[PDB]
Protein backbone atom coordinates (compact mmCIF):
# COMPACT_ATOMS: atom_id res chain seq x y z
CA UNK A 1 0.00 0.00 0.00
CA UNK A 2 2.90 2.43 0.74
CA UNK A 3 5.06 4.14 -1.99
CA UNK A 4 7.78 6.89 -2.17
CA UNK A 5 6.38 10.21 -3.49
CA UNK A 6 8.55 13.07 -4.85
CA UNK A 7 7.03 16.57 -4.67
CA UNK A 8 7.08 18.49 -7.98
CA UNK A 9 4.69 21.43 -7.32
CA UNK A 10 -10.60 32.95 -19.00
CA UNK A 11 -13.75 34.85 -17.85
CA UNK A 12 -15.92 31.66 -18.52
CA UNK A 13 -17.45 31.67 -14.99
CA UNK A 14 -19.02 35.10 -15.92
CA UNK A 15 -19.58 34.63 -19.71
CA UNK A 16 -21.28 31.21 -19.42
CA UNK A 17 -25.08 30.84 -19.94
CA UNK A 18 -24.76 28.82 -16.70
CA UNK A 19 -22.50 31.26 -14.68
CA UNK A 20 -20.83 30.33 -11.36
CA UNK A 21 -18.84 31.63 -8.36
CA UNK A 22 -15.84 29.95 -6.69
CA UNK A 23 -16.06 28.93 -3.01
CA UNK A 24 -13.15 28.25 -0.66
CA UNK A 25 -12.97 24.68 0.72
CA UNK A 26 -10.13 24.65 3.28
CA UNK A 27 -8.94 21.64 5.33
CA UNK A 28 -5.57 21.87 7.20
CA UNK A 29 -5.40 18.02 7.40
CA UNK A 30 -5.57 17.81 3.58
CA UNK A 31 -3.21 18.43 0.63
CA UNK A 32 -4.22 20.52 -1.33
CA UNK A 33 -5.46 22.31 1.81
CA UNK A 34 -7.42 24.86 -0.30
CA UNK A 35 -9.77 23.74 -3.13
CA UNK A 36 -11.80 26.38 -5.03
CA UNK A 37 -15.18 24.88 -5.91
CA UNK A 38 -17.79 26.18 -8.40
CA UNK A 39 -21.36 26.92 -7.24
CA UNK A 40 -23.95 27.73 -9.95
CA UNK A 41 -25.20 31.35 -9.79
CA UNK A 42 -28.80 30.50 -10.88
CA UNK A 43 -31.26 27.56 -11.02
CA UNK A 44 -31.90 28.42 -14.66
CA UNK A 45 -29.59 29.56 -17.48
CA UNK A 46 -29.20 32.97 -19.20
CA UNK A 47 -31.20 33.29 -22.47
CA UNK A 48 -30.53 35.45 -25.64
CA UNK A 49 -32.37 38.34 -23.91
CA UNK A 50 -29.90 38.24 -20.96
CA UNK A 51 -32.64 37.09 -18.54
CA UNK A 52 -32.73 33.87 -16.41
CA UNK A 53 -34.63 31.13 -18.24
CA UNK A 54 -36.33 28.79 -15.70
CA UNK A 55 -36.89 26.06 -18.35
CA UNK A 56 -33.17 25.31 -18.66
CA UNK A 57 -30.93 24.32 -15.74
CA UNK A 58 -27.47 25.44 -14.58
CA UNK A 59 -25.89 22.15 -13.30
CA UNK A 60 -22.41 21.74 -11.72
CA UNK A 61 -19.96 19.60 -13.60
CA UNK A 62 -18.23 17.36 -11.01
CA UNK A 63 -15.12 15.20 -11.12
CA UNK A 64 -13.27 12.83 -8.76
CA UNK A 65 -9.97 14.38 -7.57
CA UNK A 66 -7.04 12.75 -5.62
CA UNK A 67 -6.19 14.39 -2.27
CA UNK A 68 -3.76 13.49 0.57
CA UNK A 69 -5.03 13.35 4.17
CA UNK A 70 -2.71 13.15 7.24
CA UNK A 71 -2.73 9.56 8.62
CA UNK A 72 -2.73 9.23 11.64
CA UNK A 73 -4.28 12.72 12.28
CA UNK A 74 -1.90 15.73 12.84
CA UNK A 75 1.14 13.77 11.45
CA UNK A 76 2.97 16.03 8.92
CA UNK A 77 5.08 13.13 7.42
CA UNK A 78 2.40 10.41 6.90
CA UNK A 79 -0.65 10.47 4.54
CA UNK A 80 -3.55 8.46 3.00
CA UNK A 81 -4.90 8.84 -0.59
CA UNK A 82 -8.54 10.03 -0.79
CA UNK A 83 -11.02 10.55 -3.64
CA UNK A 84 -13.43 13.51 -3.30
CA UNK A 85 -15.95 15.11 -5.69
CA UNK A 86 -15.39 18.76 -6.68
CA UNK A 87 -17.48 21.09 -8.89
CA UNK A 88 -15.11 22.62 -11.52
CA UNK A 89 -17.79 24.71 -13.33
CA UNK A 90 -21.42 24.74 -14.47
CA UNK A 91 -23.17 23.72 -17.71
CA UNK A 92 -26.67 24.44 -19.12
CA UNK A 93 -28.95 21.40 -19.65
CA UNK A 94 -32.55 20.84 -20.81
CA UNK A 95 -34.39 19.40 -17.77
CA UNK A 96 -35.66 15.81 -17.20
CA UNK A 97 -39.51 15.68 -17.15
CA UNK A 98 -40.74 13.12 -14.59
CA UNK A 99 -43.94 10.96 -14.83
CA UNK A 100 -45.06 7.40 -13.67
Amino acid at each position, epitope marked *: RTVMVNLNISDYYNRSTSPWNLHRNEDPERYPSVIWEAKCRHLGCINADGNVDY*HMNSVPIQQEILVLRREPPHCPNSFRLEKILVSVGCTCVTPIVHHV
Partner: antibody, heavy 119, light 113 residues
Protein backbone atom coordinates in the same frame (compact mmCIF):
# COMPACT_ATOMS: atom_id res chain seq x y z
CA UNK B 1 -48.82 10.23 -0.88
CA UNK B 2 -47.24 13.63 -1.99
CA UNK B 3 -47.23 15.94 1.05
CA UNK B 4 -45.74 19.32 2.18
CA UNK B 5 -45.79 20.26 5.89
CA UNK B 6 -44.79 23.76 7.00
CA UNK B 7 -43.72 25.05 10.45
CA UNK B 8 -46.27 26.71 12.82
CA UNK B 9 -47.26 30.38 12.86
CA UNK B 10 -44.87 33.03 14.22
CA UNK B 11 -44.72 36.56 15.63
CA UNK B 12 -41.55 38.57 14.85
CA UNK B 13 -40.55 42.07 15.86
CA UNK B 14 -39.82 44.67 13.09
CA UNK B 15 -36.21 44.28 11.91
CA UNK B 16 -35.93 40.62 12.94
CA UNK B 17 -35.68 37.62 10.54
CA UNK B 18 -38.06 34.65 10.14
CA UNK B 19 -37.23 31.12 8.95
CA UNK B 20 -40.17 28.99 7.64
CA UNK B 21 -39.60 25.21 7.02
CA UNK B 22 -41.32 22.89 4.46
CA UNK B 23 -41.05 19.10 5.07
CA UNK B 24 -41.57 16.96 1.93
CA UNK B 25 -42.71 13.33 1.63
CA UNK B 26 -44.24 10.88 -0.90
CA UNK B 27 -41.61 11.51 -3.59
CA UNK B 28 -37.82 11.82 -4.28
CA UNK B 29 -37.02 15.21 -2.68
CA UNK B 30 -34.06 15.95 -4.92
CA UNK B 31 -35.96 15.42 -8.23
CA UNK B 32 -38.35 18.43 -7.86
CA UNK B 33 -37.92 22.19 -7.37
CA UNK B 34 -39.43 23.90 -4.29
CA UNK B 35 -40.96 27.37 -4.75
CA UNK B 36 -42.02 29.87 -2.06
CA UNK B 37 -45.08 32.09 -2.48
CA UNK B 38 -46.61 34.59 0.03
CA UNK B 39 -49.97 36.30 0.59
CA UNK B 40 -50.46 39.48 2.77
CA UNK B 41 -53.97 39.63 4.44
CA UNK B 42 -56.75 39.97 1.86
CA UNK B 43 -54.16 40.31 -0.94
CA UNK B 44 -53.06 38.32 -3.98
CA UNK B 45 -50.34 35.62 -4.25
CA UNK B 46 -46.69 36.73 -4.73
CA UNK B 47 -43.82 34.53 -5.88
CA UNK B 48 -40.81 34.83 -3.63
CA UNK B 49 -38.24 32.36 -5.03
CA UNK B 50 -37.07 28.83 -5.95
CA UNK B 51 -34.51 26.14 -4.91
CA UNK B 52 -33.25 23.04 -6.81
CA UNK B 53 -32.71 20.63 -3.79
CA UNK B 54 -30.31 18.52 -5.89
CA UNK B 55 -27.69 21.29 -6.19
CA UNK B 56 -28.84 24.16 -4.01
CA UNK B 57 -29.28 26.41 -7.06
CA UNK B 58 -31.70 29.25 -6.43
CA UNK B 59 -33.52 32.12 -8.09
CA UNK B 60 -35.23 34.99 -6.26
CA UNK B 61 -37.71 37.81 -6.77
CA UNK B 62 -35.80 41.16 -7.02
CA UNK B 63 -38.70 42.98 -5.21
CA UNK B 64 -37.55 41.48 -1.88
CA UNK B 65 -33.96 42.51 -2.64
CA UNK B 66 -31.25 40.58 -0.77
CA UNK B 67 -33.70 39.83 2.16
CA UNK B 68 -34.84 36.29 1.08
CA UNK B 69 -32.59 33.17 1.46
CA UNK B 70 -34.04 29.78 0.38
CA UNK B 71 -32.24 26.55 1.32
CA UNK B 72 -32.86 22.76 1.28
CA UNK B 73 -31.60 19.84 3.33
CA UNK B 74 -31.47 16.59 1.38
CA UNK B 75 -31.16 14.42 4.57
CA UNK B 76 -34.33 15.82 6.31
CA UNK B 77 -36.27 16.45 2.95
CA UNK B 78 -36.85 19.99 4.16
CA UNK B 79 -36.66 23.33 2.43
CA UNK B 80 -36.50 26.63 4.33
CA UNK B 81 -37.20 30.26 3.52
CA UNK B 82 -35.46 32.95 5.51
CA UNK B 83 -36.84 36.50 5.31
CA UNK B 84 -34.60 39.13 7.05
CA UNK B 85 -35.20 42.80 8.10
CA UNK B 86 -38.93 42.25 8.67
CA UNK B 87 -41.41 45.08 8.03
CA UNK B 88 -45.12 45.41 8.99
CA UNK B 89 -45.80 44.76 5.22
CA UNK B 90 -44.13 41.37 5.56
CA UNK B 91 -47.05 40.21 7.71
CA UNK B 92 -48.38 37.40 5.45
CA UNK B 93 -49.10 33.68 4.90
CA UNK B 94 -46.04 31.97 3.43
CA UNK B 95 -46.51 28.87 1.20
CA UNK B 96 -44.14 26.28 -0.22
CA UNK B 97 -44.98 24.48 -3.50
CA UNK B 98 -43.26 21.78 -5.53
CA UNK B 99 -43.05 22.60 -9.27
CA UNK B 100 -42.46 20.15 -12.21
CA UNK B 101 -41.70 20.29 -15.93
CA UNK B 102 -44.75 18.26 -17.15
CA UNK B 103 -47.32 20.60 -15.62
CA UNK B 104 -44.86 23.52 -15.64
CA UNK B 105 -46.33 24.89 -12.33
CA UNK B 106 -46.89 24.16 -8.64
CA UNK B 107 -49.11 21.15 -8.12
CA UNK B 108 -48.48 20.19 -4.43
CA UNK B 109 -48.69 22.91 -1.74
CA UNK B 110 -47.85 23.25 1.95
CA UNK B 111 -50.62 24.26 4.36
CA UNK B 112 -49.26 27.79 4.85
CA UNK B 113 -47.47 29.68 7.62
CA UNK B 114 -48.74 32.93 9.13
CA UNK B 115 -45.99 35.43 10.17
CA UNK B 116 -47.18 38.48 12.10
CA UNK B 117 -44.69 41.36 12.13
CA UNK B 118 -45.40 43.10 15.47
CA UNK B 119 -43.61 44.70 18.43
CA UNK C 1 -42.14 41.81 -14.03
CA UNK C 2 -45.12 40.53 -16.11
CA UNK C 3 -48.43 42.10 -15.09
CA UNK C 4 -51.45 39.76 -15.05
CA UNK C 5 -54.84 41.55 -15.22
CA UNK C 6 -58.08 39.66 -14.37
CA UNK C 7 -61.61 40.74 -15.31
CA UNK C 8 -64.02 40.77 -13.52
CA UNK C 9 -62.71 41.29 -9.96
CA UNK C 10 -65.83 39.74 -8.42
CA UNK C 11 -68.76 37.63 -9.63
CA UNK C 12 -72.08 36.46 -8.07
CA UNK C 13 -73.41 33.46 -9.99
CA UNK C 14 -76.58 31.38 -9.57
CA UNK C 15 -75.74 27.67 -9.20
CA UNK C 16 -76.22 26.08 -12.62
CA UNK C 17 -75.36 29.33 -14.43
CA UNK C 18 -72.12 29.68 -16.45
CA UNK C 19 -69.10 31.82 -15.42
CA UNK C 20 -66.18 33.27 -17.34
CA UNK C 21 -62.91 34.92 -16.15
CA UNK C 22 -60.46 36.82 -18.37
CA UNK C 23 -56.63 37.00 -17.89
CA UNK C 24 -54.39 39.31 -19.92
CA UNK C 25 -50.60 39.52 -19.55
CA UNK C 26 -48.44 42.58 -20.28
CA UNK C 27 -46.21 40.42 -22.53
CA UNK C 28 -46.71 37.13 -24.50
CA UNK C 29 -46.62 33.96 -22.35
CA UNK C 30 -45.17 31.84 -25.21
CA UNK C 31 -41.79 30.32 -24.27
CA UNK C 32 -38.72 30.09 -26.57
CA UNK C 33 -39.06 26.27 -26.76
CA UNK C 34 -42.85 26.51 -27.66
CA UNK C 35 -44.96 26.02 -24.51
CA UNK C 36 -47.42 28.53 -22.95
CA UNK C 37 -47.12 28.55 -19.18
CA UNK C 38 -50.49 30.06 -18.23
CA UNK C 39 -52.30 28.28 -15.35
CA UNK C 40 -55.54 28.60 -13.30
CA UNK C 41 -55.86 28.13 -9.54
CA UNK C 42 -58.77 28.20 -7.14
CA UNK C 43 -58.10 29.35 -3.52
CA UNK C 44 -60.60 28.83 -0.70
CA UNK C 45 -60.13 31.22 2.26
CA UNK C 46 -57.38 30.03 4.63
CA UNK C 47 -56.31 27.19 2.30
CA UNK C 48 -53.49 26.76 -0.22
CA UNK C 49 -54.29 27.40 -3.95
CA UNK C 50 -55.61 24.26 -5.80
CA UNK C 51 -54.46 23.69 -9.48
CA UNK C 52 -57.35 23.79 -11.95
CA UNK C 53 -55.86 24.20 -15.43
CA UNK C 54 -52.21 24.01 -16.48
CA UNK C 55 -50.58 25.09 -19.78
CA UNK C 56 -53.68 27.13 -20.97
CA UNK C 57 -56.08 24.25 -21.55
CA UNK C 58 -55.04 21.10 -19.63
CA UNK C 59 -57.26 20.09 -16.74
CA UNK C 60 -55.47 18.80 -13.67
CA UNK C 61 -56.19 15.25 -12.50
CA UNK C 62 -59.45 15.30 -10.54
CA UNK C 63 -60.73 18.65 -11.92
CA UNK C 64 -64.34 18.23 -13.29
CA UNK C 65 -64.92 18.88 -16.98
CA UNK C 66 -67.08 21.98 -16.11
CA UNK C 67 -63.73 23.83 -15.94
CA UNK C 68 -62.13 24.67 -19.32
CA UNK C 69 -59.22 26.81 -20.50
CA UNK C 70 -58.42 28.66 -23.70
CA UNK C 71 -56.38 31.51 -25.12
CA UNK C 72 -53.00 32.36 -26.63
CA UNK C 73 -50.19 34.97 -26.44
CA UNK C 74 -51.48 37.55 -23.96
CA UNK C 75 -55.25 36.86 -23.63
CA UNK C 76 -56.69 33.90 -21.76
CA UNK C 77 -60.13 32.78 -20.47
CA UNK C 78 -61.27 30.32 -17.76
CA UNK C 79 -64.86 29.16 -18.27
CA UNK C 80 -67.16 27.31 -15.78
CA UNK C 81 -70.13 25.76 -17.75
CA UNK C 82 -72.24 25.27 -14.59
CA UNK C 83 -71.37 26.92 -11.32
CA UNK C 84 -71.65 24.65 -8.23
CA UNK C 85 -71.52 25.53 -4.48
CA UNK C 86 -68.07 23.92 -4.10
CA UNK C 87 -66.73 26.45 -6.67
CA UNK C 88 -66.85 29.37 -4.14
CA UNK C 89 -63.42 31.05 -3.69
CA UNK C 90 -60.83 33.24 -5.35
CA UNK C 91 -59.57 32.32 -8.83
CA UNK C 92 -56.04 33.24 -9.93
CA UNK C 93 -54.27 33.08 -13.25
CA UNK C 94 -50.51 32.56 -13.16
CA UNK C 95 -47.57 32.67 -15.55
CA UNK C 96 -44.51 30.48 -15.12
CA UNK C 97 -42.87 31.49 -18.51
CA UNK C 98 -40.89 34.50 -17.24
CA UNK C 99 -38.95 35.03 -14.02
CA UNK C 100 -40.24 36.26 -11.62
CA UNK C 101 -43.40 34.16 -11.83
CA UNK C 102 -46.54 36.27 -11.45
CA UNK C 103 -50.26 35.88 -10.47
CA UNK C 104 -53.37 37.90 -11.28
CA UNK C 105 -55.21 40.11 -8.69
CA UNK C 106 -57.67 37.22 -8.18
CA UNK C 107 -61.43 37.08 -9.00
CA UNK C 108 -63.86 36.37 -6.14
CA UNK C 109 -66.73 33.99 -6.95
CA UNK C 110 -69.80 34.24 -4.80
CA UNK C 111 -72.63 31.75 -5.12
CA UNK C 112 -76.01 33.52 -5.67
CA UNK C 113 -78.09 30.94 -3.85
Amino acid sequence: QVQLVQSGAEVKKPGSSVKVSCKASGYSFTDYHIHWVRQAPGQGLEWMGVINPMYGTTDYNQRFKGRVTITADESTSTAYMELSSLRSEDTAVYYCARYDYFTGTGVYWGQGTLVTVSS
Amino acid sequence: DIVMTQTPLSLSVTPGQPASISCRSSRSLVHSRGNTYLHWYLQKPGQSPQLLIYKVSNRFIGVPDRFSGSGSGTDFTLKISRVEAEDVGVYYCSQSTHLPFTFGQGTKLEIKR
